[model samples]
Target chain A: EPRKVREFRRREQEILDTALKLFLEQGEDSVTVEMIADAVGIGKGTIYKHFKSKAEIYLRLMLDYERDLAALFHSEDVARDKEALSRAYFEFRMRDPQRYRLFDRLEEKVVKTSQVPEMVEELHKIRASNFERLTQLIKERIADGKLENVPPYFHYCAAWALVHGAVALYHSPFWREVLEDQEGFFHFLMDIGVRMGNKRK
Target chain B: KVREFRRREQEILDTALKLFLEQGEDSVTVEMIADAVGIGKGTIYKHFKSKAEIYLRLMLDYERDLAALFHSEDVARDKEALSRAYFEFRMRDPQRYRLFDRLEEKVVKTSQVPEMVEELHKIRASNFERLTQLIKERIADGKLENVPPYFHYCAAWALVHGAVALYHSPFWREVLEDQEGFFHFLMDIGVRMGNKRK
Candidate 1:
């Protein structure tokens, strides 16, 4: 059992990293188990031992990304300043956008353990937990009388609306051809997120 | 020159719309359109290079329809015309409804079909502005009562698109008990925004 476990871990990581590269470089539709096996130098049986299919690999990648992102927002550093943390989270998403773009492009569904039943649940977990972390940070600032009082959920929704909307805009051609400055767009969206949610009134 | 081109372009679109509604958008080919309209497929191709281009034209037509409806309805003291116009437009245009659903499906995974995404956004932005301006006018008139002008369009359009995207779409059927609830929900949301005054 120990030997089998070690082999599974190695093959799973191999399949995950290779599949992400292929799914990104080519279209998701073009990649197959055989192609992945060929690239990784693993047999079809070995690949299937780790993941039932390439889609499972994708689902794992997304879940892992969501988990890590959730963890990062909860870390002591990000739990200090609400606006700063929100900006930093968005900057990270924009900074290395391939996986984000890849996630948007690839749509796959597979059975998973009861621990993660729905994608929306994972999305909610990501947003709500991050919001909880931010609310704690803001309450600290609020206690100092530096920021005004507003519903934490309103600030959460505002930050989310700005960040999610901005990520969508970066993929937009109109933004490139018309907006002219990606950094300015990023800064402007962050500024709006800050002011809209700012309790400094 | 402009007038002549517009006249012929209108002819092409009229033919395309007829072909689209009679047979769904995906089923209607450039050849079928030209054959129906008494023009060559080459002529249809001359107007638009691909089926997606034809979709954008149809969407542009719908955008014009919405803009004109908004302009006419903006003067109404009673907003019933506005709601009715929104509902009736989607109900009447089966092909446009289906075409829009297809476009939305493509948009979700746009990186898979990057070519169509830009044009789709261009069409969406114009339609959004028309909807936004109408809400802005209503708010300016103090008709919206407590509603914020900026946020209304997002909520309203999300509701409208959800409804239309449900009723006309097979994709959303499983998500609802009766797809019509979507339109009812939208109407309920849009209608409740105004105050009942003496």
Candidate 2:
């Protein structure tokens, strides 16, 4: 990469890194574009040159993270094992609670409102493509007879829900009484996901 | 005399629902509902004890409506029918569905009233109880596999509710463009998840 292009990438990462921290520390509602700019030691206008608004910054940050996960999963060295995929997904999320928090807060703040239509469009595009890739992986595994021949969408929904529901339950004080151990709860979710696809005669 | 009281209570509920849909829940108050209904705030209190009670009552009414649908002859035996009824109920009145989500979040997590929390718990327990019984019937009748009923219940709950919530979420804007397709997707997914041994 050219020096100037590399510099641009570095600054964009800086802005995202700063925004992530600020958004997590203060809830996304309270974090302002100006605060992010100041944290990055850049002018607000410069930040705007890279991103349109706070919502755009959020969208880009998530897109970047999803891209990283896609790259990780698609690499040749990674096994085509469902258990490995489930554990990798679990570990990636557990190791980065801050990133998860930022993403969660973004969804709460921006995913419902109609304030940023274009950014929302960009996000759905990212999600749809990712969902498609995941769906294809499940279909291939089913064809290989490694998984059951159930409706493929169920595998898709169950796997996604297993992760999301686990995270949501983890946040609830009431559910903590029903399920106490964190690691045990995670593996239980993993079991549900893996079982949903277990090959049956 | 009893008929008159029931009529007045329905009137209050209608007004509260209208105001809540017009403004966000937190912004709407008892005074606003009273004003909208052309009644005094104290009369509103007579209909319901507090603003929270009014919202809770509205949700409880909706839950009963769903239970009635679930019990109907056409839907009573079919799991897919129940899922369809739920999706139709949500699509027909997305605003009310959103209100239900908000109430679950607001009332269950943060409400100060112990009775309200307990009442909410009762409603949830009853729902799960009904769902568990239905699943058990399916298992016995050879329509579902013999997994722990709780896992089945949780998995079904998560998928159906997750899809409903996702459809409304702004992040899934692109996915909702094909609404018919999305509905089929959810129905197919639910059918597979609840399938018997093949």
Candidate 3:
């Protein structure tokens, strides 16, 4: 990369990091673009060069994580391995708890609250791509008679809900008290996916 | 005199719950509720202090109804019985189900009342306690799997909740074209989650 481009990209990273901190401290609804610029010590116009608006910046964060998810499921083994995929997702959230919260709340914050057309479209595209990729892998397993012959989407919903449901309760203050064993709970969630894959008699 | 007061209170609560469920709680205002109930706004204040109070009362009514249903059926011993009651309840009043499902979010994130939140928590804890006892009995009978109480609750609730929660999603609508087929699919998922392994 050229020197000017590298410098620009480096500055953009600094701004994103600062905005993420503010977002985590306060919520997405409370944080403002001016606050982000002031924290980065950059003019609002300069920030606009990298992002059209604050919504665009939030969209970029979602896209960055979506790319990581794509790469995680890129391998043939990971795509076909239900247990491995479940573990990878759990560990991904475990590594960066804040990112997990951001990802979970992205729909509510960006799509539901924001009126930005471009950002909403971008998020929908990313979500559809992720769902499609998982469906492809699931279809392959069913063809090999390694999994149940249920509709691919139904299987996906069941597996996705189990993982997300456990994680959501784990993070919630009220429901967190209901949990007895976190590790055991994680395994039980993954087990639902495993059960789904069992060949029907 | 006390009978009249109780009847008036019931009338106000029923109207408020209908509006709150049809529209969202935030969108429904005091005047709208009063207009629907055909009473003066002042009469509403006499029954409940504020809109938040009416929403809380609606939530408590739901909890009471759920307890009544659970007690009336052999839900503890028969897994299918509980599933049937759940399906029946959702079908009878889907708006109520939706409102109850969103209760936690409304109370925890939106509402500013600490006492209301605590009251909801207590109601939820009692429900969870009842569910735990039922699960324990089923496990001892070797009808359900041996899992952590929390895990069982999380898994069972997720499956059932997802069925109702995502039924309205645009994406799921594309997949779940047949209503009966979808309900059967949901019940299958629930049975699998609760069934004991060989």
Candidate 4:
């Protein structure tokens, strides 16, 4: 078979992108193949040409996440500094509320049954590469004596704790009412987190 | 028999927890618990006066377990090890940890069950004071920074408890891989935050 042209690739991407938007707005579980087709202005068969089934489309969306992230991983702006990288990663994650929550639950759903095993393996492979790249960045920072002597993961977990905990604070019992400077608190924690493991005298 | 009565009460507690975990704290009512336990609602009332009572009883056990972890164990002597123990307990069963949070909110507002709540309150205060004392000791030894103990403790709480509190929450609006990796990472910082430069 001849390779698909960029135009064809672009169309498939539009389909995926549109499907993502639908899933975001209306919720993933409610969005269907027909709905995606109507939104993409394509026939059902045309959508099928891109994805074997709706099941495949769902997993492919998840795979697209890592693939998109992998592209962003080595970008000059993002990997500039640990703090900048942390902030960039946080924005990429937290900017889209629906996207974040969808993937969270979506992983739960498809994992029990292992939907689209092929894409799943590729997803894991891309994730490993991204992880390696980030870990190496931390390693070099450590070697530069910029980071503390602790493991690279300490930096990662600190950011996760700070970032995730920041969002969850509004949902916690009294903090929802008690937290006065929500955005300020988040920034303060991020500031503290990025500087958490500094090499001290 | 009082022995049978105690055993029956334990049965009700276990059943209630199972239901709460399965559905949610709000969805699992005393009636549903009785239905699952193959008993009348009156039996549940007999075991505990009301739903809040059950919630408090279970919460008391959770605090007691935590108290036991800190009391019997010598993790208190080692800061990093101590934090590891604290995070371990908080992270072990996040669902139960979260469940208790919601339950605590409900009971705190429309409160009841004094004996159990008193014990729970005492355990929490004691734990808080103990951790504050540890911070003071670390400050004296130049292990931790000179800051208000509450500030240090809350920083740790916001990180450690925040990790578990929001693990699967709707608050996560973005997809970030390496969820578990960052968990221990956050804990690492939480453990070391406010420590003297070392």
Candidate 5:
């Protein structure tokens, strides 16, 4: 990257870093463009040079985080391993929660359209392909027609629900005291998922 | 300044929604939304008479079209299709979960908001009864399992809602962004209802 590009990147990161802290500390409603600019030591107009609006900045930070994590999974070392992908996904989220919080808060936005939002449709496609691939792997591994009873759709939904519910509970003050180790939590989730696997119809 | 007024009103709503999601609903105040949205407290009043009124409108409108769409009798008695529609509406309206979080609070506090809560319960009960009728029909025809209709309604509702509330987790929120897998889950559950094996 060029020097100018690096400088702009630094500035943008500063704004995002500041915004993330403010959002987590006082909640999203407490944060403002002026506050972000002030925290970044930039003028209001200067902030817009790098991003369109607060919502855009907030959305961008999350997309950036998602891409970064996806890139890690796509690396040559981690490819083709469904278990590894699930484990890595949970670890990445638990290890650095500020970035995770951005996505968590963004998730609350109502998307009532039967059609996927154009902004995120591609991401969904990538995930659905991954889902299909993982399910295929599970189909091959479990014998005795074990999965004949459980619908593939239920398996997928159950996987997501388990992972999601675990994360929410883990993040809560109540559950944090129980699920302390990030890796341990992932293993625990995978263990339960695998058990839900081998029982026959 | 009509445009400004409209902007302020939207700002208030947007801010309220954002706050209510991050903090619990009880943690917010009309003054807080006003301050965060860059308006005076009086301006919030200028647009809406009371905070509860603002809550009521958001709750109603968010699910208004959704309720209308979900309650239609156009499924032609397709049980799987009916279940799919149920799951789709909940997953599709992600914000409604939080709106529902607020409504759950209202439901719990029915003594304080009886009229509003009663209206909400009425809407929900009618929908619940419809699900009951569908399950009973399926049972009658031997197309569904022998589970009681109420259990059918509860299990399906729990599954979709448990799945919905779980979607707020950072991991699921990220994945659920594009995946329409929720409908698949509901359809699968309906299929399980038809199965005799286990």
Candidate 6:
């Protein structure tokens, strides 16, 4: 690659690092393009070369997160097998509880604002696609008699409830002692999740 | 400015808690809180370091209020009373219950303020130690399962959290024939979720 293009890529990476730092530190609304530029030791006009605006910065981070998460599963065995998909989902959220929560908060804010219309829509699109993918998996499992005869929606929502509760409890200092022995606890949680709506018992 | 400072600090919390209850954690922003309190967002920061801190303080108040449930002489030891006290505390105001649940997730996830978090740990830890021992005793007495302490506690918590989330969710009306009946049904199940199998 040309040194010119390499330098441009490096600068964009730097801006992303700095923006994430401030956003995580003071929260989303408290951060601004001007603040990010100053923190990055660049001028506002200079920062514009990297990202068009502040909302772009937020969306880019969220969009990339969606892409990364989507990349975790393919349409083959990974998504086809019930146990594999459930473990993958649990591992994805519990891996870094912080990022999971930040995007959750940011996604809500991004969707509500009109400032980033297309990006907001794109985030929703990716989310729904992921949801739909799992819904289909559950449907197939049901027809094969491998899963419960309830609505696929109920099974999925049940898993959502369990994982969401687990994630929240995992981060709680109060619950930390109880959830200690991380590996054992996670295995325990995953076991319950996998069998939760399975055809057996 | 000492008294004035302390007063405004409380005034801010009062407003934030109300707003969080009325709307939700994500929906209610610092700007809205400031407007509710007749102060600028910057002024809101004067008393609280960050929006997360404000939420932390609200959680403190909520936790402390919950700690109150253990006060009645017979409440803490009796399984039914213990479960009922905790469940009703949240069920009485499902909004606040769910709000704190989300706030706990956000506050602990971001982990913005450690000191407040530490205090929260102290309060809930004390409660946990007490209830955990209770579960242990029950297990030995053959009243509950032989699983880990967290298994029992987490099952009840998951049940309650799921209940609140499902109760307020749009589908609540669609799926539920009798809301109150379902509410008590879950409560009944929640109380016995940890009981030993026959």
Candidate that scores best on DockQ: 3
Which of the numbered candidates is closest to the native, going by highest TM-score? 3
Considering TM-score, where higher is better, how would the candidates rank from best to worst?
Answer: 3, 2, 4, 6, 1, 5
User: Candidate 3 on B120-168: residue-level lDDT in tens?
Assistant: 6677678778777766766777867787666666776655554554655
Ranking by DockQ: 3, 4, 2, 6, 5, 1
lDDT of residue A187 for candidate 5: 50
Candidate 6 clashes between residue pairs 3 or more apart in a chain or in different chains: none
TM-scores of the candidates in the order shown = 0.47, 0.61, 0.72, 0.60, 0.45, 0.59
* Model 2 agreement with the true structure over B15-121: per-residue lDDT tens digits: 88988888988999889888888888988777788887888888778767766665666544676566556546544455677687788777656764668667767
Tens-digit lDDT string for candidate 1 (B118-143): 65466667767766766776677666
Best by lDDT: 6
Where does candidate 5 stray beyond 4 Å? A1-201, B1-19, B22-28, B31-47, B62-67, B74-77, B106-110, B181-187, B190-198
The reply for model 4, stretches above 4 Å from the true place, is A1-4, A76-83, A163-186, B1-52, B60-95, B98-158, B165-188, B191-198
Question: Model 5, B94-159: lDDT tens per residue?
Answer: 666756666655743553455765776566666666667777877886766565564455344434
Clashing pairs in 3: none
Report the interface RMSD that candidate 6 achieves against the true structure, in angstroms. 3.5
Worst 10 residues of 2 chain B by lDDT: B83-92
**lDDT of every predicted structure (CA atoms):** 0.58, 0.69, 0.70, 0.71, 0.61, 0.73
Q: Compose the digit string of candidate 6's lDDT tens values, residues B15-73.
A: 88888777766788889999999989999878887789988888887778877776566
C-alpha displacement of A16 in model 6, angstroms? 3.5
Native interface contacts kept by each candidate, as a fraction: 0.00, 0.12, 0.24, 0.45, 0.08, 0.10
Best of the two (1, 2) by TM-score: 2
lDDT of 4 by residue, A101-174 (tens): 57767877774467878777777788788778767767776887878777676665455565555555545555
**Predicted structure 6: lDDT:** 0.73
TM-score of chain A of each: 0.68, 0.77, 0.74, 0.78, 0.68, 0.78
Cα lDDT tens digits for candidate 1, A40-137: 99788888877766656766777777777777666555336655765666566555455666765543333333233565456556656755766766
